[PDB]
Structure formats: structure tokens, C-alpha cells
Amino acid sequence: QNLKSTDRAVQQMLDKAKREGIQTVWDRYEAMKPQCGFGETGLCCRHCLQGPCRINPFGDEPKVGICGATAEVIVARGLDRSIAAGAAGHSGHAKHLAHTLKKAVQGKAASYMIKDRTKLHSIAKRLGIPTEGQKDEDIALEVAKAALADFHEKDTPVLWVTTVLPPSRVKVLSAHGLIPAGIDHEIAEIMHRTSMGCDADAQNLLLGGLRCSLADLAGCYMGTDLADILFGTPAPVVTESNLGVLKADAVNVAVHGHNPVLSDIIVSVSKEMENEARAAGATGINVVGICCTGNEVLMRHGIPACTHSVSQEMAMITGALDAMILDYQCIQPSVATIAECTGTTVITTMEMSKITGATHVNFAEEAAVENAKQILRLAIDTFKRRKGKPVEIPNIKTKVVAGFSTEAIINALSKLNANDPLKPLIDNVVNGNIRGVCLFAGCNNVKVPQDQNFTTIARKLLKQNVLVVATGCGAGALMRHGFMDPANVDELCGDGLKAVLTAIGEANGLGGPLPPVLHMGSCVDNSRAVALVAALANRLGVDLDRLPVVASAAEWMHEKAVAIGTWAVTIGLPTHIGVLPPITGSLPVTQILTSSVKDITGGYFIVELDPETAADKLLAAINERRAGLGLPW
Amino acid sequence: QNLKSTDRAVQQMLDKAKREGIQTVWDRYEAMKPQCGFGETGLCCRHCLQGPCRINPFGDEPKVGICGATAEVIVARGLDRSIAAGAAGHSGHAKHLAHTLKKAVQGKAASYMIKDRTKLHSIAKRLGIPTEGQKDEDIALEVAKAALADFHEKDTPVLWVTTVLPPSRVKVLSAHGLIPAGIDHEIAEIMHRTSMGCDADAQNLLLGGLRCSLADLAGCYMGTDLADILFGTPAPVVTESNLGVLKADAVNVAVHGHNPVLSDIIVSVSKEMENEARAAGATGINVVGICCTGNEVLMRHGIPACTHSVSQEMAMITGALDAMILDYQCIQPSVATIAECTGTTVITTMEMSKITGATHVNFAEEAAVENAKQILRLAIDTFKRRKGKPVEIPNIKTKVVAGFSTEAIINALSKLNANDPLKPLIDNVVNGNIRGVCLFAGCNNVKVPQDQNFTTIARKLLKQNVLVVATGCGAGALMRHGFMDPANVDELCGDGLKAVLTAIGEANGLGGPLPPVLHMGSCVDNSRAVALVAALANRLGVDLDRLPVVASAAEWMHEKAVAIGTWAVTIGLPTHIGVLPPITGSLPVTQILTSSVKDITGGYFIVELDPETAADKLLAAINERRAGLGLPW
Numbered sequence A, B: 001q002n003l004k005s006t007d008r009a010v011q012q013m014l015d016k017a018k019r020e021g022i023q024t025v026w027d028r029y030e031a032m033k034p035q036c037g038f039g040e041t042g043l044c045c046r047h048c049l050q051g052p053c054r055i056n057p058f059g060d061e062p063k064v065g066i067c068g069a070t071a072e073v074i075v076a077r078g079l080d081r082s083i084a085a086g087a088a089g090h091s092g093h094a095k096h097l098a099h100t101l102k103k104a105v106q107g108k109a110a111s112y113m114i115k116d117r118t119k120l121h122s123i124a125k126r127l128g129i130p131t132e133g134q135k136d137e138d139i140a141l142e143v144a145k146a147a148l149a150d151f152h153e154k155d156t157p158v159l160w161v162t163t164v165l166p167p168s169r170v171k172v173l174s175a176h177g178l179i180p181a182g183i184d185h186e187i188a189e190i191m192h193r194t195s196m197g198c199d200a201d202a203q204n205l206l207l208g209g210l211r212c213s214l215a216d217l218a219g220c221y222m223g224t225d226l227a228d229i230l231f232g233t234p235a236p237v238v239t240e241s242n243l244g245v246l247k248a249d250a251v252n253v254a255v256h257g258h259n260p261v262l263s264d265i266i267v268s269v270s271k272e273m274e275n276e277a278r279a280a281g282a283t284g285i286n287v288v289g290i291c292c293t294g295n296e297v298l299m300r301h302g303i304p305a306c307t308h309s310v311s312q313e314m315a316m317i318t319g320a321l322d323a324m325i326l327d328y329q330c331i332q333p334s335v336a337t338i339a340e341c342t343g344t345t346v347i348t349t350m351e352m353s354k355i356t357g358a359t360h361v362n363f364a365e366e367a368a369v370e371n372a373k374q375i376l377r378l379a380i381d382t383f384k385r386r387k388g389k390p391v392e393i394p395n396i397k398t399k400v401v402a403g404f405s406t407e408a409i410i411n412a413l414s415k416l417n418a419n420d421p422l423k424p425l426i427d428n429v430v431n432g433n434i435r436g437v438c439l440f441a442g443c444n445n446v447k448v449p450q451d452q453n454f455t456t457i458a459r460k461l462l463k464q465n466v467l468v469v470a471t472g473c474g475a476g477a478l479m480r481h482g483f484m485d486p487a488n489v490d491e492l493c494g495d496g497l498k499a500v501l502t503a504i505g506e507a508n509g510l511g512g513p514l515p516p517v518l519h520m521g522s523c524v525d526n527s528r529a530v531a532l533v534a535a536l537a538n539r540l541g542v543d544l545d546r547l548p549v550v551a552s553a554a555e556w557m558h559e560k561a562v563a564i565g566t567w568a569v570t571i572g573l574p575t576h577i578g579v580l581p582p583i584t585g586s587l588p589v590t591q592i593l594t595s596s597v598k599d600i601t602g603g604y605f606i607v608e609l610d611p612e613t614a615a616d617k618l619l620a621a622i623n624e625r626r627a628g629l630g631l632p633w
């Protein structure tokens, strides 16, 4: 089971699932080998009914699609559609929050409100929305209307691109026509240009994809902005992660998916309903998090993370998981089947995200508290059905310090230098106590032993004094292996990194260092890391493609992560990817994405499947930037 | 060569290509067999990097995708993405025209203008735009702004859906939540819900697809509306089709693609440049049409159709084709390679539609006449390079009567009954001179001998007194085989259909009948057939799912046609498809699309690959509607 997952709680539940006969994601993967080489390399097209068309990676015919599409067109078209699909996910999430804020400040959804008035005012100021003399409700109404307006063409480009990056970066991107005109506009134009008998030039296609990845960036940043206004900007919190956060004696409720508009209410309402839970014989309601919506309520409220990504089924295998409350994105549809064996109530809540066999509760912001009570009563019913049964909850869990928004990080640094908070961080880069910054992002992937690339690369970078930040299931992996525990700084961090983490933590009254890895939130909260990097570039007066900053999608899976990986490159970052995207069937395309893009944006993809080699390549990339700034290394 | 194409001019050029060693679409198809059974049935998913996932149609594992996606989810998700891609094509075309009209009436593009003031006024009246007391420039500005506003969410639903269908049809669709909120909104929400770990319910997914097909409808209708305003509503025209419309002694220029904003200017400017052409030794400029943009300039100006769809390469094989001017959609990228052997100048003009190896001319409406002259000079240069060479133009061509817009058809009927023009058509339905109406739409497909299903089904329906109308390459197929020639009415049409076509034509001063098939325009002009059917339903006071009207995508290929086929079903039509979409790997989905959808919209798909059986099944469907109205049959 140790070739499946490096998580010990996960290995325990794999043994249970095996002997109970519950098929898992690793079983379904096994039943799928050997996988199709055509798809794996991207030499397959089904964009019309003359297809499917395949091209042999090597050898004789077929060498070309039926319409004449070459290998590089087919490969670039497929990649473009994954970027567009990822943008569509991050944009739908952000759109839903834009409507929720509009509804709230029009008096249409009283469960929702402007919780972070400071953030609302900086966002409105960043957008050129006038604040002085206006009600908060009116400023927020303007901000929501600007959010919705970035989805279509208008007099301006997408403001959640052009106002969040340094003007020098906006200029480099404009010169190549990469600035999105509208979020859903770019998504549609990609689907258009990649359909049969349209765009058939690899460079033209990939330039369209870079622009569409920036539409994804805009969706990510807008999602983070709106969630912070609605639900509070994260600040440092202490909690726990992994399966031992389940409690056999409580109604255990998992919030699972990506959009917190739902789960944040569940967190609030579940406290209300503790007495109703005690009456059925529970200690209370134990809300826990899965995937990125769990990270949302982890960053804001300190809700313990139960599990992530490829291993989500394992939470139900315990037999303790009474309800699993789903919005959308990255939910294995297998949970609906597996619940018939485990007793779990699987509840979908979102109109466009249903799973056959799951209970659906039609959630409306106008009725959020009504719906949350309805949902938590079903969980309480489910606990009663198992009241008495034996559960197997692995007694495994780690301590997690999280909540490192960009504002929290700046505030933390401001305790060493009140008037120039970025300077202490930069000073320690210059003198070498911080070699550079690495952002770990993205999913787990069944092809990679769970968390193996994340921890291996993280261990090597930290020993080399890299400041490591993390998001999404990359944060999930690092946290479940103790990387968000300050007590492991001594083991994990090099002396220079140790000193800076200790100096910052001691100055924030903790008598102890910051955690070895800074948890910056969910997948859309990759935009937080953009805000920090942009702030550092602006403070040093250079473009982002000169900073010693890199990214690692170490075990990535989802179309969202392809989009994220692609705008990481487009804003100027060397960007490591740990699972091959379907690109190797075309060397010209591979050459564009790993080398030639450097001359366009200054970022590039680093393809490397072996995590030790990946760490070396990421340190090289970081050290190359240091030398480019004239620093020692 | 007669198993490849039933077109004799096409068979001639296949012989030439064979002996000159030019590989063709049929050669590339041959080199691709046997095709992948997984893709062919829709049991293949590449929506994440854990994939590709395949499911065995029959037998043992794999039975399920790695994440747990079942066969019906995977199949429904793939179909949903093809509908979204088709909508994105039809919507991008319509969007480009909306901007062109905005630019024109703001004085920014003088080559463009309001050519059909009557149509502009009915459209504005249909939309609730006030006309009385307003300038045309201002009314048009309002119409363009409404067009652009149907792409995103607003206070109203998509008006190019809700104002073009009978209120009863809008009600049936609303009750199931099928009304699009915004065109690019639906495209994005489809890409969202079909991405990994989202919507996993076949019925929920397909309901999203029906709604997205209506976004495609809106794009089609908006494209037709704007093109008519900009370039004139078609009225009956006489011209010719097939390869013998090339002239060895002239500069032969093909307009190819779908968007006429470009080609309509070429038609105008090419007349200006005849003397420049004579100076190089040509008789003049011979502009001809390929695919749907050729149909556009065929409907409006009588430009001869040269060829269509699967056989477009064959135009270059003649050696006479000096330039091929491309916008986007359905252009085989092979033309860029084949031009190195034939001397043809292949010119792309659209920013998001480039082909490696082709000359690009950056077209701007602001500079249209400049660009057209630039492009036609390159054609004239190309004629000079071949001045003297032997060309092989098959001396094959048919007579084509076309230009049957819905307004032209109504005008034609108005000569038999001035105050109730639809009544003569309805009278002849009731008494049986017209059994019903069949709309042939969509592409050719290399899997089907070119035009074989179109002509076979057409022959059987016409003998049974079906009024047949046609669009896109279905019109292209029927016209190239003589079905737009009034001289074939006696051979082709049953006596009852013959009488009605003769009565209408004799009343329009032709001393002769209407053609055996009414050519209603390009693919977006399938919306014209909606307008006629809607007008007939409104005149009879029934919903569209009670009219003896059917559709045939007899040899369909493109994602656009999947979307078209799907909104044909969604507005209530029995809809025959002549090539299997990737749906047979899931019986539940197949059952929804061929039977169970009847209870939702009243339309349904008719899967039938044998054209004689298809004709029988379409007559059955038509006769079932007749009986439902109480008519004889």
C-alpha cells in the first residue's frame, strides 16, 4: 500500500477497503493499465465525427489527422482546451461569489455580508472604484458589478488581470496581445479556434492559450478577493490535519469541493445545532474539510483538514463519516457508490454538479441557513443509524499552522520593520538566508505515490533555505506530513531559513518560528502568491521574470492546474510539472513550452518526473535568477 | 473513386491527385483505419492527467473511469463539450458581426453599412428596441448592443432565444430550465460542469447540453440577423455550382470559411479590379465560393459555388485556383500543404485562425477595401505565374436557383394569397399536396461517400411530396447534383409537390416551378428555417412539436452540427443523424437522446446510417405528426 500513498492513515484505510471489497481509485487505476499511448502523448483528436484521429508517436501511418491536422496542431489544440476548461472552473466559482456579494448588499441574502471592510476598500481602490463618501453597500455593489463585467468584452480589458500585475508585466503581455478581453470570451474563443477547420498554427494556438490562462488567473484572483470580502481575510490559525481529526463520538461532517459560499455557512450553523446533536447522543457536530473548500474553512475558521484529492474516498472507509457535503470540482463520483457500503450521506448542493445516487439539496443563498439545517439534520440522522457500530479511525494526525494570506505575511514581516515590511524578507534573500521562493500548487495524481513528489522536493528545497509556500492539495500533502508544524523547523529547514522563520515568529509573540511551509490557501488562492510576488517585484523595481521565485505542480491532475501552471509561466515563473501533460507527441510544442516561451514571458515549464532531479532543476532555476540579480549563490 | 464521392467532378480530380501523388482527405482517412473503437463509441475521457481513461464497450475491465466516472457520465460529458464547441463557433461568428455593425454605425468602418433597413427595423421591433423617432444609426447601435449583451448574464435571458420561438415553446423550455442565461456563459458553464470531479449525472448533464444548444441557436439567429442587416436579405438568385465554374482564362479566387464580413467585400472589390486583372492577361476576376461563406455570397450576390466540405482540396487540384481566401471553420489545414504542389496562394485573414505555411493578411473592417485589394493582387500575381500552363477543370456544373430566405419564401407565397401568405402552404399540407417539410443540414463526412445520404434521402422524400429545404453543405450536396434546378422538378418531385412548386413559380412570373429544393443559406441560416417553422406554428396555433417538420443531418461531421442537431431536437423536431455520434457506449444516454427527450421537448434524434431506412423513418415521423393533427396520410 506504500506504492499507493505515503500517508499512513491512507495506507490503513486501503487495507480496510481491500478486505471489505470496496474498490478504490487505485484499484480503478490498476484496472486501467496499460493506458493508451496516443492519449498519454496528446496524439489523439475527437474534435469532429470524422475522428477519432490518432497519430503514431513513431513509425509509419497514421502521421496526420484526417483533415490534415498535424501532430503539433492536435497537441496544441488539446492543451488549449484544458486551459479553457480550467479557466471555466475557476471562473464559475468566482462568478458565483460575485452574484452572492451582489445579492447580499441588495438585501436579498441575509446570511451573507461584507465581513472584511478593509479588503473591500483596497479592492475598490485597486479597481478605480470611488470610495470616499459612498456606502459600503454601494462600493461592494460596484465591486461585484466590475467582477461580473470582467467576464465579457467591454471598454477596458479584464481588470482582474491588468490591475493585479506590475505595469511592466502588463506591457510585456500586451506587446504579444496576451491580455484577455473577457473571461468567458476567452474560454469561448478557445473552444472556437480549436474546433475542426480553424486555427492550425502551433505558435498561434499556444499564444491563445497563454491569454486564456490569464483569464484563469483573473478568475482565481477575483475568487480570492470576493471570498475574503464575504468571509474574512485569513490570518494565522492553528488546527490539525489527516484522518485522526474524525471523532467516533461526534456527527462528522465533511465539506468537500471548492466553493465556500456553502461550507462557510455550514461552519456557522453547525455550532448552532450542537444541542440538537447532543440530543441524538453525539458530542456535537465535527465539521471537517476535504479538498479546497476544506482549505477555505481551514484558512478562515481553523476547521481541521481530514484528507485531500486522490484519497478522499478513504475518509468514508473509516465508517465514521456521517455526511459529505459537496459543491463542485475534484469530487470523485465514486463517493456516491461507496456511500452504499459505508453509511455516509453524500449530498450534492449545486444545480450544475449532481451525482447519480446522491441526495440533492437545492441550495440558495436566499435560504442558506434553512438549507444548512436541513443538511445537518440528515447528518445527525446518519449518526443515529451508526450509534453503537465500530468505526476504524486511524489515530494519525499532524499539527497545522496555516492562514498565511499575503496580508498576514506582510503583517508578520511588519513586526520586524513597520514601515517597509517587505524589506526584511528581501534583505534575507540578498544575504542568502533565503535562497528564493517556491510555490507548491495543484493536486495529487493516482500515477504518483500520494504526496511523494511534494515531500521529496520540499525536503530538498527547505534544506537549501528556500522559502516554501503552498496551496490547494499541495498544501494538503505538505501539511499531512508535518510541514505546517513549527516543531519540525529544526529537522526540516536549513540554518539560514531557520533563522528567518525564528526571527519572524519570535517577533510575532510565539516564542517560536513560523512553520516550515507557509499555507496560502486554496487553488484560487494561488492568486495570493501572485500578489506577494508582484509586491516584491514592485518593491525591487523589477519584472516578475527576474525574481528568484519558482512554482511546482509536483503531482498535478486537473484541467484547473494546467491553466494555473500555464499562467505561472505567463507571468514569468520557471514552473515545474511532475506529471507529463499530453504534449510529448509534438517536439515543436514541447520546445515552445519549455524553452522558446522564455523569450515571450520569461517563464518556462520544467518537465521532470523524478522529484530529486526536479528539486535540483528548481534550485538551478532559482540560482540562475540570483545570478541575474548579481546576488551570491 | 465512386466509393469516395458521388460527385463526378470530384471523381475526376481524385484521379488527378492520385497520379500526381497529392495525398487527399480520403487517403488520410484510409491511413487511419481501423479507427479506435473507444473514441468511436464515446467511451474515452482525457479530462484530467490521471487519464486517458477508456471503458470497454463489452467484456471485462476497465468498466469505469479512474475517478469513478461511469460510461454514461463520460459519454454525456463528451457530447456536452461538442455542443459547447459548436456554440462557440456559431457565437464567435455572430459576435464578430455584432462588432462590425457597431463599428459601421459609429463611423469607424466605412466599407460597411446598414444595407437592409427593413430587416433592421423588424429585428429592433422583435427585441423591443424603440424605432419611432430614432435614427437608423441609433437603432442599429441598439441592436448591436443587444447582440453583444446576449453573450453574458443580464436582467433578461438570451433574447435571440426568447424572441424567436413561439411563447408556448419558450414556456416548455423554461419549465425545464433550458433557457440560456448568456451565450458565452453557457459555453463556460458546460466546460466547468464536464471537467473532472463535477457534474456526474447523465440526465443533469444532457439538460445542460440542451440549454447550451439553444445558446448555439441564438448565435445562429443573431449571425443571420446581423449579416442580413449588413449585407442584404437574400432573394431568389440564379447561378451555377461545382468545379466547372472555374474558368482557365480568369484569375479564380475562392472565398472559403463561414464569416462573410470579409468575402462580401472581396465580391465588391473584385469588380473594381477587373481592368487590373485584364492587364495581366486574365479575362477578369472569377470569385467562387467554397463551404458556407461561399453560400453566403451565393445567396446574396449569386456567386457560383465551386465545391464544399470533404472535397475542398479538389478545387486546388485543377491547377486553376489562384487564391483561396480563408476566414475560419471547416477549412482542412491540408490546403496549406497542397498549395505547394498546385501553385495556389492560400491566405488566412483572421487573427485566431492561422495555418502554418499560409500567407496571412491581417484583415480589419477599418481597412477592408485596402486588404481586399492587397489580397486580390496576390491572386493576380498567381495567375501570371501560371499564365500558359495546362489546367484540368472538369467541365461539370449544375444550374442553381437559390436565395430562399424566409422573407423570400413568404414573399413567394404572397403571390398566391397577399394577406395570408402562409395559408397556401398550409392548405397544401392539409390536403396532402405537401406531406411535410424536411430540412437537410450539416456537413459531408469522409466516412460516407460524398453526398450519398443527402441525395438518396432527398430523392425518396421528394417523390413522397415532402417540401425539402437545405442549408450549409447539405444545400451544397443537393445543388451539385441538380436539386436546385427547376428543370428536374418533373423527374424528382411527386405530382402533389410538383403542382405546388409550379403554382408558386408560375405566380412569381417564371413560367416555371420553384426548384425541387429550397436553398435557405449557410449553417447559421438554419435559423431561417426556425423562423419559417415558428411562423407556421404561430399561424396554426400549435407548438413546433406538432408540425409535420423534421430535420436530417445526413452526413454530419462538425461540432457545430452536433449543436445544431441538438437544438433541432430541443425546439421540437424529429432529427435524423446519418453518422453515429460518440454515444453508443452508453445505452441510458442513447435512450435519452432517441426516446426519453420526447417527453421534455417533443423532438428526438433518429439514428440511422442507411439512407433508404432513414427516409422511411423520416416519412414515418412526418406521417405521425400528420395523424397527430388529424390529417390524412
Ligand code: SF4
Binding pocket: A045, A046, A047, A048, A049, A050, A051, A052, A053, A065, A066, A067, A068, A069, A074, A195, A196, A197
Ligand atoms: S478535427 Fe481533424 S484530427 Fe480531429 S477528429 Fe476531426 S479530422 Fe480528425
Ligand code: SF4
Binding pocket: B045, B046, B047, B048, B049, B050, B051, B052, B053, B065, B066, B067, B068, B069, B074, B195, B196, B197
Ligand atoms: S476525469 Fe475521470 S474518467 Fe476522465 S480522465 Fe480523469 S479520471 Fe479518467
Ligand code: FES
Binding pocket: A036, A037, A038, A039, A040, A043, A044, A045, A052, A053, A054, B036, B039, B044, B052
Ligand atoms: S486513440 Fe486512445 S486516446 Fe484517442
Ligand code: FES
Binding pocket: A036, A039, A044, A052, B036, B037, B038, B039, B040, B043, B044, B045, B052, B053, B054
Ligand atoms: S483510447 Fe482511443 S479514443 Fe481514447
